[PDB]
Curated annotation (Swiss-Prot), chain A:
Subunit structure: Monomer. Part of a ternary complex composed of SMAD3, ITCH/AIP4 and NEDD9/HEF1; within the complex NEDD9/HEF1 interacts (via N-terminus) with ITCH/AIP4 (via WW domains); the complex mediates ubiquitination and proteasomal degradation of NEDD9/HEF1. Interacts (via WW domains) with OCNL. Interacts (via WW domains) with NOTCH1. Interacts (via WW domains) with JUN. Interacts with JUNB; the interaction promotes ITCH-mediated ubiquitination and degradation of JUNB. (Microbial infection) Interacts with Epstein-Barr virus LMP2A.
Annotated tissue distribution: Widely expressed.
Post-translational changes noted in the entry: On T-cell activation, phosphorylation by the JNK cascade on serine and threonine residues surrounding the PRR domain accelerates the ubiquitination and degradation of JUN and JUNB. The increased ITCH catalytic activity due to phosphorylation by JNK1 may occur due to a conformational change disrupting the interaction between the PRR/WW motifs domain and the HECT domain and, thus exposing the HECT domain. Phosphorylation by FYN reduces interaction with JUNB and negatively controls JUN ubiquitination and degradation. Monoubiquitinated. Autopolyubiquitinated with 'Lys-63' linkages which does not lead to protein degradation.
The protein's name: E3 ubiquitin-protein ligase Itchy homolog
Record's disease association: Autoimmune disease, multisystem, with facial dysmorphism: A disorder characterized by organomegaly, failure to thrive, developmental delay, dysmorphic features and autoimmune inflammatory cell infiltration of the lungs, liver and gut.
Domain-related comment: The WW domains mediate interaction with PPxY motif-containing proteins.
Portion of the full-length sequence here: 249 to 268 of 903
Biased composition (Pro residues): 4-18
Species in which this protein is naturally found: Homo sapiens (Human)
Gene that produces this protein: ITCH
Subcellular location: Cell membrane; Cytoplasm; Nucleus; Early endosome membrane
UniProtKB/Swiss-Prot annotation, chain B:
Positions of transmembrane segments: none
Protein name: Rho guanine nucleotide exchange factor 7
Domain SH3: 2-61
Modification(s) after translation: Phosphorylated by PTK2/FAK1; this promotes interaction with RAC1.
Quaternary structure, from the entry: Interacts with PAK kinases through the SH3 domain. Interacts with GIT1 and TGFB1I1. Interacts with PTK2/FAK1 and RAC1. Interacts with ITCH and PARVB. Interacts with unphosphorylated PAK1. Interacts with SCRIB; interaction is direct and may play a role in regulation of apoptosis. Interacts with FRMPD4 (via N-terminus). Interacts with CaMK1. Interacts with BIN2. Interacts with YWHAZ. Interacts (via PH domain) with NOX1 (via FAD-binding FR-type domain).
Parent sequence residues shown: 183 to 243 of 803
Localization (cell): Cell junction, Focal adhesion; Cell projection, Ruffle; Cytoplasm, Cell cortex; Cell projection, Lamellipodium
Gene transcribed to yield this protein: ARHGEF7
């Protein structure tokens, strides 16, 4: 029972978390 | 007093810690910091935090 | 069977149940790879999409 899952989220992925200097 | 930018969420974003700001598409966010690097800071419903700058669109004043 | 596994470098929180939440250190079994910054995988009973650059390849 391997279901059929949807395509990638249509939105862009969030960037990696903020890391200030 | 001082001018302040306002943005509207284009997508949903769910914070992973208390320094990030969660929102639903359509939420109106008052911007507090803009910087290069992919993240801006703003306030929504009494919460403050960073969010992806590419996840919002501007609102005409 | 050979499998691709990745380890979370950063936390990620789903916005719906087609996306996979995880914490730094979680090991995820990859189910789909596509261009665009999103991969799909399985962690502890759930399957969903997540940002590919939040994880690093490891070995099972």
């Amino acid at each position: 029972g391997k279901p059929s899952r949807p395509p990638r989220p249509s939105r862009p992925p969030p960037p990696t978390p903020r890391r200030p200097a | 007093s001082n001018n302040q930018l306002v943005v509207r969420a284009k997508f949903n974003f769910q914070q992973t810690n208390e320094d990030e700001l969660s929102f639903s598409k359509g939420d109106v966010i008052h911007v507090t910091r803009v910087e290069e690097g992919g993240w801006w800071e703003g306030t929504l419903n009494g919460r403050t935090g960073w969010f992806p700058s590419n996840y919002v669109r501007e609102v005409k004043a």
